[PDB]
Design a binder for these strands. Sequence first.
DNA 1: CGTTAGGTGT
Length: 301
Amino acid sequence: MLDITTITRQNVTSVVGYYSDAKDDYYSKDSFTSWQGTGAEALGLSGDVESARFKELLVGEIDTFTHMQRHVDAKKERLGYDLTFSAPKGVSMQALIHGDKTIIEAHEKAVAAAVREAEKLAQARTTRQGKSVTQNTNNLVVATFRHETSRALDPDLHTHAFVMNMTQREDGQWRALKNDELMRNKMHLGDVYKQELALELTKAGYELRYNSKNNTFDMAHFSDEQIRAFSRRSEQIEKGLAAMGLTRETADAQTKSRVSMATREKEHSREEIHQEWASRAKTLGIDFDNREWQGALEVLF
DNA sequence: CGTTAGGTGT
Ligand SMILES: [Mn+2]
């Protein structure tokens, strides 16, 4: 389950929360950031993501000697690509309300696996014989940010895998990515994440259910209504489209994406949110004690 | 500065 958002100088204010949104989270200190990608290795980046270096690379400052010029209108300058890997809602509820670190490890492994596959799609433009050509570079600079809450204050385990708009070419020059291949492969990269996550959840003893219509899975001990109760943003987007005389099918991803920000809302202690999750789960009659190594293995092969 | 397009909705 992957979403791709292009971060430009116009909408860069959507990143203000990469660090603050994780404070007092359940598993943020065991941390919530990591440098990934062979490109990051080349730049000597590893471990936790420091805000100083992140902001430098965001604007194209690779070092004091090298600054990229990715504009011709700087307002439309592309700074990176937010690759958001979200876990299934039921998976989030079990990991965050009941509490199972094993699910956090699976999500991080599935994200790391998905980032590695994405690297095989990195492309850049050179010039040969006066003509412009395209080459495969096989390196990306990725800073991941793991969050536990949605904009509607629901449990939503997801990681922002921020891909800088830079790739090192064969000649050593750092240049802007040719994103075409990455955009076309959104669903494939989500499948890599889903496949790894499902395999790890199965090894942990969770019964999963499969939806062949949209090629997704989730926990099998949650009803379609119990999951809906913790999916307020999806409801807000459906109500938003309904106001436009549209449904999730009649609407295009172009408009549906804008309904997310337009419906998006802008102070509550994390202690309050967590307790609210438990009580609500108790109101719905949810029993989280369901890691018992049972089920018919619906998401096996 | 176009291009992707599970709804859980980044
Ligand atoms: Mn987030």
